[PDB]
Design a protein around this ligand. Sequence first.
Ligand SMILES: CC(C)CCC[C@@H](C)[C@H]1CC[C@H]2[C@@H]3CC=C4C[C@@H](O)CC[C@]4(C)[C@H]3CC[C@]12C
Ligand SMILES: CC(C)CCC[C@@H](C)[C@H]1CC[C@H]2[C@@H]3CC=C4C[C@@H](O)CC[C@]4(C)[C@H]3CC[C@]12C
Ligand SMILES: CC(C)CCC[C@@H](C)[C@H]1CC[C@H]2[C@@H]3CC=C4C[C@@H](O)CC[C@]4(C)[C@H]3CC[C@]12C
Ligand SMILES: CC(C)CCC[C@@H](C)[C@H]1CC[C@H]2[C@@H]3CC=C4C[C@@H](O)CC[C@]4(C)[C@H]3CC[C@]12C
Ligand SMILES: CC(C)CCC[C@@H](C)[C@H]1CC[C@H]2[C@@H]3CC=C4C[C@@H](O)CC[C@]4(C)[C@H]3CC[C@]12C
Ligand SMILES: CC(C)CCC[C@@H](C)[C@H]1CC[C@H]2[C@@H]3CC=C4C[C@@H](O)CC[C@]4(C)[C@H]3CC[C@]12C
Ligand SMILES: CC(C)CCC[C@@H](C)[C@H]1CC[C@H]2[C@@H]3CC=C4C[C@@H](O)CC[C@]4(C)[C@H]3CC[C@]12C
Ligand SMILES: CC(C)CCC[C@@H](C)[C@H]1CC[C@H]2[C@@H]3CC=C4C[C@@H](O)CC[C@]4(C)[C@H]3CC[C@]12C
Ligand SMILES: *[C@@H]1O[C@H](CO)[C@@H](O)[C@H](O)[C@H]1NC(C)=O
Ligand SMILES: *[C@@H]1O[C@H](CO)[C@@H](O)[C@H](O)[C@H]1NC(C)=O
Ligand SMILES: *[C@@H]1O[C@H](CO)[C@@H](O)[C@H](O)[C@H]1NC(C)=O
Ligand SMILES: *[C@@H]1O[C@H](CO)[C@@H](O)[C@H](O)[C@H]1NC(C)=O
Lengths: 344, 344, 344, 344
Amino acid sequence: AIAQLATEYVFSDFLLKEPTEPKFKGLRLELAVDKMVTCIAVGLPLLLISLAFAQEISIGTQISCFSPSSFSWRQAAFVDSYCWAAVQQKNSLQSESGNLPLWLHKFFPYILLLFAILLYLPPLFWRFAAAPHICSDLKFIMEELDKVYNRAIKAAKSARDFKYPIVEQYLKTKKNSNNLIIKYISCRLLTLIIILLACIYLGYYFSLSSLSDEFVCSIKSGILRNDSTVPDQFQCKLIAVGIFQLLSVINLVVYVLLAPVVVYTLFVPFRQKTDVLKVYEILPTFDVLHFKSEGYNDLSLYNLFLEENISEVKSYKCLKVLENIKSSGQGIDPMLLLTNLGMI
Amino acid sequence: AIAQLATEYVFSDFLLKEPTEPKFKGLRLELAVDKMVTCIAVGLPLLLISLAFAQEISIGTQISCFSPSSFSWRQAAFVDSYCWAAVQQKNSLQSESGNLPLWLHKFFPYILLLFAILLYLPPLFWRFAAAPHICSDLKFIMEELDKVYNRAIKAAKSARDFKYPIVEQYLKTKKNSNNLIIKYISCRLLTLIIILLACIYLGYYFSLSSLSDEFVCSIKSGILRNDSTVPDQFQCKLIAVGIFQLLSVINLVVYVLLAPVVVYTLFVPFRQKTDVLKVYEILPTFDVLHFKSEGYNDLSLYNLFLEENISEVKSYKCLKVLENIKSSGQGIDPMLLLTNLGMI
Amino acid sequence: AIAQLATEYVFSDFLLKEPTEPKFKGLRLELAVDKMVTCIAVGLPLLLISLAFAQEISIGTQISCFSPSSFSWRQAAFVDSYCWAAVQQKNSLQSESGNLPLWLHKFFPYILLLFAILLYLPPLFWRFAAAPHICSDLKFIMEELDKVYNRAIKAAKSARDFKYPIVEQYLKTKKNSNNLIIKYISCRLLTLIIILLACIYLGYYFSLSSLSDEFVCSIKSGILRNDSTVPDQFQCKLIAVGIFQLLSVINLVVYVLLAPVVVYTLFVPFRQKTDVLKVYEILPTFDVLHFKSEGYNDLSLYNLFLEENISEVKSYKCLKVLENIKSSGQGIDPMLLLTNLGMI
Amino acid sequence: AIAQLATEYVFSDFLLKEPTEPKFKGLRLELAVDKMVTCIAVGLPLLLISLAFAQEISIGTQISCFSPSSFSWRQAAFVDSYCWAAVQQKNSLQSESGNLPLWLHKFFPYILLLFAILLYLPPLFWRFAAAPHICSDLKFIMEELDKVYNRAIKAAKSARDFKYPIVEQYLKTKKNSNNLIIKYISCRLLTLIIILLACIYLGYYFSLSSLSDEFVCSIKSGILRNDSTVPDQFQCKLIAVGIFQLLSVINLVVYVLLAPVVVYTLFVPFRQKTDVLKVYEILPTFDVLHFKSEGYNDLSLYNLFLEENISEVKSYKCLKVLENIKSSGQGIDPMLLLTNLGMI
Ligand SMILES: CC(C)CCC[C@@H](C)[C@H]1CC[C@H]2[C@@H]3CC=C4C[C@@H](O)CC[C@]4(C)[C@H]3CC[C@]12C
Ligand SMILES: CC(C)CCC[C@@H](C)[C@H]1CC[C@H]2[C@@H]3CC=C4C[C@@H](O)CC[C@]4(C)[C@H]3CC[C@]12C
Ligand SMILES: CC(C)CCC[C@@H](C)[C@H]1CC[C@H]2[C@@H]3CC=C4C[C@@H](O)CC[C@]4(C)[C@H]3CC[C@]12C
Ligand SMILES: CC(C)CCC[C@@H](C)[C@H]1CC[C@H]2[C@@H]3CC=C4C[C@@H](O)CC[C@]4(C)[C@H]3CC[C@]12C
Ligand SMILES: CC(C)CCC[C@@H](C)[C@H]1CC[C@H]2[C@@H]3CC=C4C[C@@H](O)CC[C@]4(C)[C@H]3CC[C@]12C
Ligand SMILES: CC(C)CCC[C@@H](C)[C@H]1CC[C@H]2[C@@H]3CC=C4C[C@@H](O)CC[C@]4(C)[C@H]3CC[C@]12C
Ligand SMILES: CC(C)CCC[C@@H](C)[C@H]1CC[C@H]2[C@@H]3CC=C4C[C@@H](O)CC[C@]4(C)[C@H]3CC[C@]12C
Ligand SMILES: CC(C)CCC[C@@H](C)[C@H]1CC[C@H]2[C@@H]3CC=C4C[C@@H](O)CC[C@]4(C)[C@H]3CC[C@]12C
Ligand SMILES: *[C@@H]1O[C@H](CO)[C@@H](O)[C@H](O)[C@H]1NC(C)=O
Ligand SMILES: *[C@@H]1O[C@H](CO)[C@@H](O)[C@H](O)[C@H]1NC(C)=O
Ligand SMILES: *[C@@H]1O[C@H](CO)[C@@H](O)[C@H](O)[C@H]1NC(C)=O
Ligand SMILES: *[C@@H]1O[C@H](CO)[C@@H](O)[C@H](O)[C@H]1NC(C)=O
């Protein structure tokens, strides 16, 4: 039913499932905006496919040819099925709009499924190629941040009663390499191109005259070519073409609204803001150097992933509340850190 | 069946599922009133869609055109399907009420699903954008309250046998920022606007003459335009239009009753009452300062979320019972706190 | 529905399920490229089979013979079923394209299923014959790497405050044996041959005239051979043949794009690059000798499997970050290793 | 659907499920070749049964008798059902090929299911009679091997810083008894005989003229015997007989390819090679005596089961890597064993 399709595709965790494995425990591995874009671009065409053939919106068979009254039920069924299979056969049918509109009307669900698959492909390539590496690197970075926070609080407590910046060096090294950012931009660009092509196709499909679904059909090949009792042609109409056009314009609207989001996603350096690591600069055990901005490198992408999935880090949360309290400046950062006692 | 739909949509945890993740363990992340509003506004139109096409209420096909007796079954089926697809084609049909009523009668389930999706969108935006931040902040606040309660009871026990207000400073800082409250008000306002538009549409749909479902249909395009055996027109009726109007007025009543709730929700400062933190003011380790009221800021929203999901805090429950006992004044707050022995 | 099939076969973990057993905990046991190739080559033909007979794309029965009007419904049904069963019987039918096109049109789903099974066979043979051995060997290798890393860090810590290369000897011994690599190459080659044969078949099927689906059928055997009221022949058409050809060309395109991937897979020594063990050469407890390259031996395959599933090793990750930091050369490898404190 | 059947029967763990009980944790209890043979021989005929009546390959009803035009739909249905039930009644029908072909055409699914059940019976008898005993014995043997390995490594460590061969005596005793091997050979031989009988039946079924499915049917018993309006006979055809023959030849090919595998399985002593226990002979605590070869006794079968499910033993894996390293001979077996430190 329509409501069942809605529950499956919008109100359920459709493509929102976290990786089912212990390797990525709590790691999104995909930005929220990218996940939203993929979920829409994939589950919208599927939802429209399901809707267009819902038991309520669908009168019945997808084509009716209006055989003569003399024709029996199965003769008329032969006519309808023959014309359905003959939309491909150009000789059989003669339609003013041509045969491409008939092909599109017959295979619209296939085309929507193709667009959905093509849009799901780049996210899958990301999740299967560049996701494990970033997951491992980000897990190491979070562990290092937790360890340095613990060491700093222990030092502060000892004072009240190595020291090498490994994480900073690793981030600096990531500043050079750009394979991950190149893959990310390539997959986003392919998604954008697929969306644009889908928009072109949907606009063309919705621009039809709405009468191209009606085509003339001739079961006059073979032994029936010279038969007399059979009329030279029939009036066939492809039902649900109006529904297809409505859903196609809906998908076109959604995709044109979505494309600016993908373009904004492509410009990762601009998105790289609100320095996540700036909060850690007040730790004595952490060097006061952010050095993450203004670069078409994997460093900006790692900064984005950190700003996305750093809320799960207790040390980061503690430092964030310390920073927020520092806005008033009533107290002292080391005193607040010592009082917090948030090692684990 | 009707009962199955009821069990799925009203008697089950439809959209009442808690976040399936360890990050939010026991945190609602959504006020009870907001959750009720979203659940109604989403699962009502879906329930009505399912009901309108239930196997019992539905006689059968959604349109019947009453072809002549001479017409065969599949000729009549062609007529019915053609008219179903031609509700869009204005030239084919001539109805007194126009063609918009026919469009609405055909696509009412789609319109209800659209309203449900549009009403579910703002809650989803909230849960995916502003929910993680408030979850982390509120978890930190609850942990700080538990820790300060433990410290105060330990101090009392030591007396019988830092001290910095970090949580108060954090709340004071939240008094300034307003991004969360702005997002909350924006999503509530969008929900209200969607509800009002849905009410307008449902009132228009229910105000129809009830005879607009009957339209005249002409299969007279193409080779059949000059055919003689076919009548110039047919009498088609869109079945289930009365059911659609009944369910639409039901949804209109529900939404007009719900809109005052959304308006009341918009005025969060008025809702900010029954100070949750007032109970903690009797703790020696906690400063006697509430400072949370009369502000279009995130502080009021945090106060609401606390008053919502603070019952899970054992220290808060203990302080609440101490406060309630203090109404009589027979005993002493520190003595009762020491006797409680409710560290964990 | 079409969307359900898509969810099952592309958006779900179809053939992507990890081995359901404690023996292989986190071990892929199959390279990512090989898994992708198998998943495509298997779940594409199945998806096309499901699509070709979807409730929306399918008009109805797969063959209609257009019995005379005098014929009753069940007489026409007998004609259709007889011709469906007589596509095999060459005498009954006379078609210009022959009888092989009719066989193919009738049994296309069977042929796609056969290709899917034949393509799934070599992966299954691998997973049931050569997977347990490589799993055990690789688990031992990872355990040895973890143990040597722990010993090296313990030695470094002791200095700050046996020694036999068992793993290196085992890898060197693997350099000689080649049964695993021979099995891998044989299964890949069989997969490639099956893909090529499938491409040949699909090209032949798509090269048909598109009118071979229309064949002449004669129910004139037995008592009906000399019957007069029955016409000497009927015009039968195999519906969905156009859909079969469309999906067959789609599968042909996918398989021709996939075959280069399989050919590249066959050349494992070229794939053996980015020495995984090179990072471990900086450990005092590990001998400085890689000795893994330029060989049609199981050593290259083991190197590939290591480069695939070594990210799960904490010691390997730590050594990798040490290597990446060494690019700048600011610090010292032993000092960084001591500071890391990543025993477990 | 066809793809669903494929997923259930070839791509899923059909009859590949490990024993669902804690008694056999990780013990196959069935050789890989035997499991493959059983899985094929059982799930192939079931798959063919499901395929032959798939919603796509099946035109409709399994028999059509071509009643006269004067006959009504339910008169024709009576004719078809009567002939379907009268394939057994020899007097009613007169077919050139006889009545056995009609029996076979009607009950082919039953015959395939019978063959599948008969082939599944011997494996079930094994798993319910001789599997628990071998499971217990093999678990004891693995535990003894682990214990002796632990004792030997402990002795080596003590030197660096009872002694009775219970397992060897148990294996020697198993050398005498042969009940398990006799049961194994009997079940394999019964499986082979069932496969041969199935091949005979399938060859006979596929050797039919392909026109035996067409039989003459006479509804002329009872009050209708002397009725005039009813024709003396009808032309009935059993649909799907061609599909049955195709699938039967497929099953015949599979079974003839499989029978050599079963014959090779029967010769267990030849399969008994690559002495698993030879690796343990280098342990000081283990006597240097294999004494397992060249015997129609349970010892060879136990050797096969060990070679199958010994990879799960850490001590065996360690000894195997020690053996492989000994190929070069660079080091010493006791030194390598001491350095390994693989007690558990
Ligand atoms: C997804 C991508 C590939 C879709 C590409 C656009 C498709 C949907 C449409 C939009 C405009 C279309 C073209 C418009 C006009 C003509 C001229 C005609 O004489 C032949 C077909 C041809 C050349 C059409 C082919 C298909 C076409 C290119
Ligand atoms: C992503 C955005 C830009 C998509 C907007 C849809 C655009 C591309 C659509 C809307 C209307 C469409 C046009 C409608 C009609 C025709 C006439 C036909 O003979 C050739 C294609 C052509 C000229 C179409 C080309 C594509 C088109 C311009
Ligand atoms: C969800 C929102 C967009 C719904 C908006 C209201 C819809 C349901 C209805 C209510 C009143 C309607 C209008 C009433 C009268 C007319 C005048 C007529 O000559 C053209 C249509 C037009 C202009 C209608 C368009 C659709 C309309 C605006
Ligand atoms: C949220 C609350 C206010 C909704 C209450 C429903 C109201 C808005 C409904 C109920 C009856 C409706 C009217 C019924 C009939 C017509 C005549 C038509 O030619 C134009 C629209 C118009 C004038 C409708 C406008 C909307 C309407 C006034
Ligand atoms: C999967 C593998 C086995 C498929 C092999 C190719 C199949 C699909 C096709 C492609 C070309 C075909 C051949 C083309 C021409 C002829 C000549 C004709 O007089 C008899 C059939 C015969 C000999 C065909 C047999 C089937 C054939 C070989
Ligand atoms: C893997 C790649 C190479 C596959 C590409 C498809 C090729 C092999 C296909 C496409 C068109 C096909 C041809 C189409 C028509 C005929 C005529 C027929 O009488 C014999 C087979 C023959 C000659 C086919 C042989 C195979 C063929 C050449
Ligand atoms: C599974 C086992 C039992 C199958 C045994 C073979 C079956 C399928 C077939 C193969 C050959 C067949 C026989 C061939 C010829 C005749 C002679 C005829 O006048 C009576 C039936 C009889 C005697 C057939 C009986 C059934 C038969 C034995
Ligand atoms: C396991 C292997 C050997 C099976 C190979 C199938 C063999 C046994 C099949 C293939 C063709 C079959 C023959 C086909 C036709 C007839 C004629 C009939 O009047 C008696 C049975 C008889 C003589 C069949 C006996 C069995 C048969 C020889
Ligand atoms: C049909 O009859 C015409 C008469 O002109 C003839 O040309 C044609 O070949 C016939 N077709 C068939 C299929 O017999
Ligand atoms: C139908 O016949 C009329 C007669 O006036 C003619 O004008 C019209 O073009 C014909 N239509 C078709 C589709 O042939
Ligand atoms: C049909 O009648 C013809 C007349 O020539 C005869 O040859 C043939 O044998 C008959 N067929 C049957 C099945 O009785
Ligand atoms: C049918 O009529 C015949 C006439 O010869 C007679 O012999 C036979 O008994 C009748 N059968 C029945 C069932 O009445």
